[PDB]
Design a protein around this nucleic acid. Structure first.
Lengths: 63, 77, 46, 46, 93, 102
RNA sequence: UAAGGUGAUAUGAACCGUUAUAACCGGCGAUUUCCGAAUGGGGAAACCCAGUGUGUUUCGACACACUAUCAUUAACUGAAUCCAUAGGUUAAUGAGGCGAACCGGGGGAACUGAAACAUCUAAGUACCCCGAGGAAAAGAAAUCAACCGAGAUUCCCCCAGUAGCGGCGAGCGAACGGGGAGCAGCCCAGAGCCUGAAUCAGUGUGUGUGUUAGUGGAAGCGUCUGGAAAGGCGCGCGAUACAGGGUGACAGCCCCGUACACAAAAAUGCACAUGCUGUGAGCUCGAUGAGUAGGGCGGGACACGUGGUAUCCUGUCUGAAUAUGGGGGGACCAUCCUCCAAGGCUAAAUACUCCUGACUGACCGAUAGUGAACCAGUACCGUGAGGGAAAGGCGAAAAGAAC
RNA sequence: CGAAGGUGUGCUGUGAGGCAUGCUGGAGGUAUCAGAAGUGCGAAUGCUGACAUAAGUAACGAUAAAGCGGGUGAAAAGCCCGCUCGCCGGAAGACCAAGGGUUCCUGUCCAACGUUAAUCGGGGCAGGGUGAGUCGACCCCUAAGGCGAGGCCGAAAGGCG
């Protein structure tokens, strides 16, 4: 996904960075805690997706 | 800290030995004094803590020749 | 009878607490021994 | 996985050894100190 | 920006209990779990966005952990935070 | 670097079932595997109320050591031993004793 | 490298993959909350309160960077007395702190022995403190010996428990000389002649070499009992691999591995030349370390306890000459021999092991062995320093016990 | 087609000891001859652990005090409800700090604890519960006192300020 996400605008991925949090991450942290979420795996990869992004953005910009 | 600003003399440990040869520890104090030395260059004084032998030196060596050493070691006068 | 130990939290710190240990020569080399033996409680605290 | 409760008897054990050696050792002449009055009479220094 | 970002890192899960249900129906007031820090103003803003609702005012507290014994081992629950949150008359949840 | 792997055919060298044939089921880091209808242990099972609660006595496929088994050549129709070669540029497996590609 | 995995105590629920951006291993990388030398201030640690600056919605209010001390250097400034100093402000560089032993140095006991005991010993041991390196410190003769000479230091084995010191008591204890380990010698106090003339130092370039991940890796069957055979019986094969370990009982040929032969995208240590940046060469004429040696007083180390006492360091008072001169050769003068101080540098042979790798053991095998084989420096005790435990084994597999 | 170890018998030797075997146990032992030993126990007011004794004896922790009917349940004197009796009442009441660190409430269980039974409990398991502009902390100010830039003093550490 790095290769898919390696080519973009720093803001573009920064958008996606945000977007992950609005829906998805938050909701799953809410939807699931109530007990309604029947799929746990969707939580793991998402958190693993973020760190990839925040590393990219820091690779491109700054150091 | 009893010392001579010039030479480096500081005290030492030794024995007080009686007529019966009973040994006891003591300390040897270098004879010191606080003297005010004159400089012709600056035309002022300088106050140093030295011994009586350190004065014999300055009698021989140049007063400023001494300061160069101190001035080399960062010794603050 | 009035027993010896009378608990006070403050006194248990000002005296035997960390910052008092680290603030003098002896106290600093103490914690070494405490760390040397690998003890879990280094001084009295959380 | 199918263990029998926990047997703390060893707790009361270590407390007994610890309790027994503590007093029995440091209590010193308390039996004797009390006996001391007896000690000053039962003695017969002559 | 990071402002909106952090808000999404603040809240965790809504709390549930009788006492919670009462304030909902009775006082129009809600409960939810938060971060170990998660101050009032920090919470209210998040509520003003994701739920997009009005807020009377907020008050919160700290919840200590309850020591436990597993096997013969003993752990301690992580101290955490809850907040009683209030709503004006435009409420939904 | 392994010889037996996720799916293959084998036969027992020794043990309860010695001389009996089957394919692979799943491999375990313990150094063991499972085979269909070979190692069979009657289990007395508890009737878990959740979902079904059958309890009863069921038969299962037990784990087994690898060193006690070997592949079934299926040409001579008996045991034979593995070796590793590079075909093309790729590492693959072959038989000892009539070396052949797998 | 790869057909499995999603660490363990414990399975389980929900998912990716199946020849390749699953998973695992290695290298190079930002991520690294708070305390802790903490270093913005404070402070009962993991907490509290700021300042300045830059930038930022929806004023409210936020994000980020910096702000400790001291030494040194430069600049700006700048008192009492003009000048000037002193002090202050600013930036740059550097350090602090932790840690097993090993080394050097500054301080430095007592019990005990002496059959008491003060001299002496124990011992410059134990202990405190300071400083540094991976090795250190010492070191290149004002050194010994005998009229022979040898040639810096350091360590090992001999002389030898001798010569000697000593309430001549217990005790202490050499040296010269000899054989070995390993060698290496240079510079300043100065001018000219002369020039990058060796030389280190840093740089890169490549070669080789390894280090951190790994690949391959030989050759067997039947029968007997046997719960299970690797065991007995027979015939076989490999062996540069019979080291070892595991598998349902003792496997050279079932598995892992070994002998042996290979490999590095990347970063790295070493030996080379290697292109450079500095670097300083070689020859001639001089110069040769002054409160310094020695001395008096009092101490100390030298095997040496003021003894007839040489030698070295020194607290204090003194105090010579400049090789036609001086020091030394166990008091001391004389003759003789030797050597030149009072300024510096130096690799190897040597001691050490907190830790990393391999290998070994007539070392232990659960009351032994590290205090600890079992989540221990834990539980527990004490205010605190600190002290300090007991506790291994089902079974082949959990097949662990339906009804 | 059964070692070691354990548990007995029979034989044997001048003695410490040696040999075979019956039952168990389920994998190691080792001839002979030399070698090195952390090498052979009854003690040591010995060390460690296990178990007897006195003994089912003393004791069940203030003399303020209980009695009865219903309920629960396997079982009730000690649990719940109810009626009565009694005790304290400048306390044996009600609030706080200091200190404790879930002991609070509910549901739920009888193994261990409670000096006895326990349907009980401050016990075990799970879950729930602690809201501040006006309370107190935080924060401004400081006393006794400590730390203490520079400074002074000091073999070093460091002491004073």
């Amino acid at each position: 996904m790095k290769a898919k996400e390696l080519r973009e605008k720093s803001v573009e991925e920064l958008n996606t960075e945000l977007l992950n949090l609005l829906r998805e991450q938050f909701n799953l942290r809410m939807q699931a805690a109530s007990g309604q979420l029947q799929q746990s795996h969707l939580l793991k990869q998402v958190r693993r997706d973020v760190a990839r992004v925040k590393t990219l953005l820091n690779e491109k910009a700054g150091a | 800290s009893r010392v001579c600003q010039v030479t480096g003399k500081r005290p030492v440990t030794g024995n007080n030995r009686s007529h019966a040869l009973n040994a006891t520890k003591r300390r040897f104090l270098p004879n010191l004094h606080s003297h005010r030395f004159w400089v012709e260059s600056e035309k002022r004084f300088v106050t140093l803590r030295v011994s009586a032998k350190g004065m014999r030196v300055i009698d021989k060596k140049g007063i400023d020749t001494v300061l160069a050493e101190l001035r080399a070691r960062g010794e603050k006068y | 009878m009035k027993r010896t130990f009378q608990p006070s939290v403050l006194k248990r710190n000002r005296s035997h607490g960390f910052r008092a240990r680290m603030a003098t020569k002896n106290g600093r080399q103490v914690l070494a021994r405490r760390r040397a033996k690998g003890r879990a409680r280094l001084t009295v605290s959380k | 996985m199918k263990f029998v409760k926990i047997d703390s008897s060893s707790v009361d054990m270590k407390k007994y050894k610890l309790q027994n050696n503590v007093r029995r050792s440091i209590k010193s002449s308390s039996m004797n100190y009390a006996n001391v009055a007896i000690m000053t009479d039962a003695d017969h220094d002559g | 920006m990071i402002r909106e970002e952090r808000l999404l890192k603040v809240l965790r899960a809504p709390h549930v209990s009788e006492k919670a249900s009462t304030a909902m129906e009775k006082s129009n007031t809600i409960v939810l779990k938060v971060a170990k820090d998660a101050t009032k103003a920090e919470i209210k803003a998040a509520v003003q966005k994701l739920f997009e609702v009005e807020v009377e005012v907020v008050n919160t507290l700290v919840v200590k952990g309850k020591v436990k014994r597993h096997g013969q081992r003993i752990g301690r629950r992580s101290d955490w935070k809850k907040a009683y949150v209030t709503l004006k008359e435009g409420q939904n949840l | 670097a392994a010889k037996i792997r996720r799916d293959d055919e084998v036969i027992v060298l020794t043990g309860k079932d010695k001389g009996k044939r089957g394919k692979v089921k799943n491999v375990l880091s313990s150094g063991k595997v499972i085979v269909e209808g070979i190692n069979l242990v009657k289990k007395h099972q508890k009737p878990v109320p959740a979902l079904n609660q059958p309890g009863g006595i069921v038969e299962k496929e037990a784990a087994i050591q690898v060193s006690n088994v070997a592949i079934f050549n299926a040409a001579t129709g008996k045991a034979d031993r593995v070796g590793f070669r590079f075909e093309d540029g790729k590492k693959v497996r072959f038989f000892k004793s009539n070396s052949e590609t797998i």
